[PDB]
Amino acid sequence: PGIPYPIKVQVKDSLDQLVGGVPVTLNAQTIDVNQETSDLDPSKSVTRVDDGVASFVLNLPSGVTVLEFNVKTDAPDLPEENQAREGYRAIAYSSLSQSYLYIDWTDNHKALLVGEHLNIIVTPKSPYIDKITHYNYLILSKGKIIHFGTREKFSDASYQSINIPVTQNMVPSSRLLVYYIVTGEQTAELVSDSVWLNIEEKCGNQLQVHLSPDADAYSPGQTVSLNMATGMDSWVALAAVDSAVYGVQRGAKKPLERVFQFLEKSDLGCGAGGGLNNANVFHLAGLTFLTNANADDSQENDEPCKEIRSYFPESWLWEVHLVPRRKQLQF
Amino acid sequence: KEVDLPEIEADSGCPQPVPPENGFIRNEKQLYLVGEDVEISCLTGFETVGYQYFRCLPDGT
Amino acid sequence: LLGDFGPWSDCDPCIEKQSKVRSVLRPSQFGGQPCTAPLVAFQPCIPSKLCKIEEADCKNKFRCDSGRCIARKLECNGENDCGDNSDERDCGRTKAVCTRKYNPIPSVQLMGNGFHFLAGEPRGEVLDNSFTGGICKTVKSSRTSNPYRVPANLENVGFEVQTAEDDLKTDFYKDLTSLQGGSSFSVPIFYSSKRSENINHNSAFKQAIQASHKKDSSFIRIHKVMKVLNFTTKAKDLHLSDVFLKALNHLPLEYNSALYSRIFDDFGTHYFTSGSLGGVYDLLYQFSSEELKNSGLTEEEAKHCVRIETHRCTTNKLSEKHEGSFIQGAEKSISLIRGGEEKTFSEWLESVKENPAVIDFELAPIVDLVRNIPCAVTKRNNLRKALQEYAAKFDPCQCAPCPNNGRPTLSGTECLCVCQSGTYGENCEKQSPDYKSNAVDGQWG
Amino acid sequence: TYVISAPKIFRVGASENIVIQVYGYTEAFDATISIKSYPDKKFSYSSGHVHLSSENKFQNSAILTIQPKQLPGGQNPVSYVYLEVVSKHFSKSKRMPITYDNGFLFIHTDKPVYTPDQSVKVRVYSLNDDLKPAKRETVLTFIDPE
Numbered sequence: 001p002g003i004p005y006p007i008k009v010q011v012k013d014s015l016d017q018l019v020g021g022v023p024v025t026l027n028a029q030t031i032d033v034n035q036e037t038s039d040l041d042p043s044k045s046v047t048r049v050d051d052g053v054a055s056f057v058l059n060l061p062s063g064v065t066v067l068e069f070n071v072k073t074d075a076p077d078l079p080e081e082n083q084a085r086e087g088y089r090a091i092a093y094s095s096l097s098q099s100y101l102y103i104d105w106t107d108n109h110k111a112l113l114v115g116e117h118l119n120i121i122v123t124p125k126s127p128y129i130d131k132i133t134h135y136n137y138l139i140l141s142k143g144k145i146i147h148f149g150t151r152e153k154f155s156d157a158s159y160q161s162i163n164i165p166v167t168q169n170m171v172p173s174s175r176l177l178v179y180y181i182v183t184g185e186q187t188a189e190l191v192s193d194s195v196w197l198n199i200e201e202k203c204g205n206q207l208q209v210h211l212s213p214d215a216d217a218y219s220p221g222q223t224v225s226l227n228m229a230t231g232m233d234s235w236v237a238l239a240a241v242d243s244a245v246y247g248v249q250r251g252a253k254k255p256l257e258r259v260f261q262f263l264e265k266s267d268l269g270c271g272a273g274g275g276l277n278n279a280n281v282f283h284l285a286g287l288t289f290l291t292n293a294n295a296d297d298s299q300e301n302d303e304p305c306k307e308i309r310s311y312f313p314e315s316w317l318w319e320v321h322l323v324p325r326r327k328q329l330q331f
Numbered sequence: 332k333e334v335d336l337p338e339i340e341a342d343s344g345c346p347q348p349v350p351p352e353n354g355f356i357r358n359e360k361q362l363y364l365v366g367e368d369v370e371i372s373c374l375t376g377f378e379t380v381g382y383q384y385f386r387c388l389p390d391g392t
Numbered sequence: 393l394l395g396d397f398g399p400w401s402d403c404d405p406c407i408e409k410q411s412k413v414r415s416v417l418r419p420s421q422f423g424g425q426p427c428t429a430p431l432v433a434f435q436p437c438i439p440s441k442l443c444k445i446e447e448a449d450c451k452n453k454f455r456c457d458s459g460r461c462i463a464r465k466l467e468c469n470g471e472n473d474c475g476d477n478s479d480e481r482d483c484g485r486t487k488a489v490c491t492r493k494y495n496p497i498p499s500v501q502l503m504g505n506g507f508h509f510l511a512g513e514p515r516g517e518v519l520d521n522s523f524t525g526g527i528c529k530t531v532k533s534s535r536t537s538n539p540y541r542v543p544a545n546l547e548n549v550g551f552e553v554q555t556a557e558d559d560l561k562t563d564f565y566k567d568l569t570s571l572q573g574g575s576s577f578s579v580p581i582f583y584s585s586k587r588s589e590n591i592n593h594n595s596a597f598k599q600a601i602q603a604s605h606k607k608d609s610s611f612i613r614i615h616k617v618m619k620v621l622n623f624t625t626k627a628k629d630l631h632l633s634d635v636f637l638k639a640l641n642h643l644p645l646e647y648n649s650a651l652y653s654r655i656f657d658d659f660g661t662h663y664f665t666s667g668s669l670g671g672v673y674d675l676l677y678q679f680s681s682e683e684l685k686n687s688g689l690t691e692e693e694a695k696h697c698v699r700i701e702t703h704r705c706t707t708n709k710l711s712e713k714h715e716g717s718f719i720q721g722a723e724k725s726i727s728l729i730r731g732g733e734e735k736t737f738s739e740w741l742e743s744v745k746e747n748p749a750v751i752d753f754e755l756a757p758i759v760d761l762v763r764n765i766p767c768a769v770t771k772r773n774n775l776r777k778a779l780q781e782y783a784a785k786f787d788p789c790q791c792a793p794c795p796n797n798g799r800p801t802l803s804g805t806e807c808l809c810v811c812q813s814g815t816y817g818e819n820c821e822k823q824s825p826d827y828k829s830n831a832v833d834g835q836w837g
Numbered sequence: 838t839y840v841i842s843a844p845k846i847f848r849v850g851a852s853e854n855i856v857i858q859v860y861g862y863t864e865a866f867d868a869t870i871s872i873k874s875y876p877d878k879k880f881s882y883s884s885g886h887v888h889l890s891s892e893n894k895f896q897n898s899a900i901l902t903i904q905p906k907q908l909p910g911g912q913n914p915v916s917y918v919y920l921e922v923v924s925k926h927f928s929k930s931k932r933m934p935i936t937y938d939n940g941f942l943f944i945h946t947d948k949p950v951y952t953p954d955q956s957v958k959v960r961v962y963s964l965n966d967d968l969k970p971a972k973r974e975t976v977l978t979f980i981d982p983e
């Protein structure tokens with residue numbers, strides 16, 4: 001409530017592929033907490049081919065309970081009879097203290113780089129008190145908690161920007177949660193939020209293999225050298241496969257092509273983040289807090305989230321070698 | 332025998348097979364796994380002649 | 393002699409404490425500074441759980457913050473409750489269902505709750521009829537109002553006030569207290585058994601029997617009954633209270649005499665099936681048996697003299713004072729009333745409409761309400777074995793024989809030894825001039 | 838306040854970092870966090886120990902691990918375990934589930950397609966919860982298309 005609600009939609013074609021340059025619009029009805037409702041002004045935008053995602057932002061009256069947005073597609077060729085229409089619903093953060101929290105930026109780059117200090121804008125809308133003691137944040141990744149942060153809050157502005165240094169441990173992806181505590185006359189109530197953090201894929205120890213003779217094409221049977229290069233002592237496992245093996249059939253995918261993405265499955269929580277009260281945002285981030293202030297309901301065990309002789313055949317060069325710093329082999 | 336049905340074909344498995352004449356399949360189950368083979372024997376009295384086994388295919392047969 | 397102290401286990405979190413209990417042995421009889429020294433002692437502990445109601449399955453959803461799970465689709469309308477304070481969620485934001493604004497029964501809580509057979513008091517909330525069930529049902533009454541909405545738990549309800557006394561006039565059921573079924577089947581208890589009456593009423597008599605001291609104390613009683621409502625509870629499925637179910641949810645799976653015994657103490661031994669609510673005018677009077685001989689003997693007669701409001705029978709029965717003084721009208725009177733200028737009885741008669749009470753009640757065991765919970769069957773049987781050992785504590789045995797055919801009773805830690813008419817004072821210390829001390833009838837044992 | 842954050846689900850045979858934060862006071866008190874079995878009463882899997890100071894700015898984390906000390910048989914074992922925190926100003930406990938899924942396994946075959954009467958080169962890349970090599974025994978089973 002009081003904070004503009006981001007809506008990012010993406011259109012896919014018949015089989016699992018994004019489309020772009022396709023105009024889309026949405027209609028929404030904002031309802032008041034007390035009763036009745038109000039019709040929100042429709043917004044229209046197109047999906048960029050570069051980004052792949054269409055972006056929308058809706059600012060609602062402070063008395064809104066929940067909002068419903070119906071996404072429809074618009075094209076000059078498109079008839080109203082045959083079209084694409086999908087209705088959706090979003091429920092507000094529930095707080096008896098009326099206080100909320102929100103974070104911005106985070107991967108719009110797209111994604112992120114390593115070693116660079118990143119800043120995130122936060123806002124404490126509708127506080128019980130504008131004065132907040134201190135800001136606390138917990139960055140987690142790979143189903144574990146990597147770092148524990150602490151910050152200070154000042155009256156200099158309505159929204160404060162926090163700087164988070166990125167680490168090598170977070171390489172595949174990450175999540176960050178920011179919680180601030182308040183002291184009531186009776187019981188304390190803390191508010192938080194969490195957003196998925198995507199980051200460039202970079203190995204802890206960079207491995208680069210390059211042939212010593214540099215040429216566009218090599219003559220058959222030519223003795224050639226191969227060079228391994230690593231940051232730290234590492235074991236290498238080489239495989240030299242013909243390009244003709246795939247081949248049969250249907251592209252035969254790739255040898256691996258997905259590792260960090262498979263390593264990304266380690267995340268306990270599901271979705272980008274955010275949830276009912278303090279609890280649901282934590283459990284959706286993959287954590288469960290223990291505190292005096294707020295009570296944590298576990299919703300039992302259940303996790304609904306799923307996707308939410310010769311010459312010469314293949315193959316050769318099947319070996320395992322130790323590579324202290326740089327190492328080279330000749331064949 | 333509750334109606335149910337217990338069968339989940341998303342798990343991809345075979346139903347209980349029908350034995351040859353004079354029946355008698357051992358280790359009776361309601362649902363068999365794919366790749367599992369169940370031996371068949373004869374009632375009193377006969378003798379099994381030939382290769383006696385039933386293997387569950389990827390398809391339900 | 394009380395008993396040895398029990399160990400502490402299975403923390404409270406709902407109550408956020410650690411408690412123990414001590415058993416009592418050889419209750420006080422004739423005196424000697426009785427037990428006192430509170431049986432249950434509470435100690436601060438560290439809560440493991442969040443004090444929520446736990447439920448198995450609930451595949452059909454939609455769960456509540458309390459965890460009642462509400463099998464059907466309640467959300468979001470109309471009443472949006474499922475526990476305090478209305479647990480939200482449910483609502484919002486979508487209106488609406490069950491419109492037209494029906495008014496609830498002033499007191500639905502007394503038809504709820506539960507009754508302790510041995511203590512004779514409505515110990516704690518069990519039923520909680522506030523659950524709507526998603527169905528809109530209402531009954532209309534005479535004088536009120538507007539219609540009145542019916543709770544889901546109650547099978548049938550109606551306002552049967554008719555034929556102005558008549559009933560309360562044919563009442564008072566004149567009785568002189570002195571020295572199926574059957575009455576022997578009421579001893580093991582275990583519901584009905586046609587528990588509809590079968591004797592009653594609520595016992596405040598501990599003060600009356602104690603007042604039997606120094607006097608022969610012959611008693612007389614008159615009672616009026618006005619039934620404002622007649623209700624019946626659906627016995628198939630019931631929606632339990634958040635409070636009762638909470639204490640029921642958290643229990644040791646293994647059998648524990650101590651813990652389970654607290655259930656009957658807190659929530660009561662039985663729950664109401666059928667029965668009616670209203671108010672009653674009950675009064676008990678005490679007279680010296682020496683007075684009946686001096687003022688002349690009228691048995692069936694003078695029992696009609698109790699009616700009065702609004703020289704033999706002319707002035708008597710609670711002296712004015714002077715006008716009845718010669719004809720006596722002594723001595724002590726107690727209030728057995730239950731429920732609730734000019735016409736004082738009419739003052740509380742309108743008050744009983746505002747704040748009623750359960751008058752004629754029929755009950756069923758509390759063990760029948762343990763259905764459909766986690767480890768239901770296990771806790772049912774364990775509760776049966778608990779009540780059996782619990783009833784043993786109250787049933788008088790060790791109270792010892794009282795001379796002159798006196799029957800011992802049991803109130804808390806004291807027996808009180810109720811003596812038959814013709815006995816002088818409590819504890820059966822002395823005998824009246826009627827000269828019959830012979831009786832001394834036998835009992836178990 | 839004393840907010841203690843952990844993963845929603847503990848992982849058997851893994852290093853699980855537990856973080857604690859305080860409201861702060863003129864007095865600096867030490868804290869202790871540990872993982873105790875459902876038989877509370879009586880056993881202890883592991884014990885972490887921390888120290889609080891103005892230098893630490895009243896926040897610190899110590900890693901906790903659960904070794905395969907679980908009872909033999911009765912598969913699946915444990916599920917679940919208890920988490921505790923003992924400090925001067927506060928003491929609190931909570932029950933948390935466990936999972937026997939730990940680390941990652943990548944199977945690498947030399948070729949995507951093989952001809953009959955041909956050997957299949959295979960190697961597996963094993964990793965810890967910390968992504969370290971995690972030297973462990975591994976079984977490799979092959980299954981027909983049938």
Ligand SMILES: *[C@@H]1O[C@H](CO)[C@@H](O)[C@H](O)[C@H]1NC(C)=O
Pocket residue numbers: 552622623624666667668
């Ligand atoms: C009064 O109540 C009983 C329930 O206690 C009810 O079942 C019976 O029908 C009632 N009496 C009349 C005259 O309707």
Ligand SMILES: *[C@@H]1O[C@H](CO)[C@@H](O)[C@H](O)[C@@H]1O
Pocket residue numbers: 579835836837
């Ligand atoms: C024998 O048995 C019961 C209770 O013991 C009653 O019949 C009577 O009190 C007697 O003592």
Ligand SMILES: [Ca+2]
Pocket residue numbers: 466467468469470471472473482
């Ligand atoms: Ca409802």
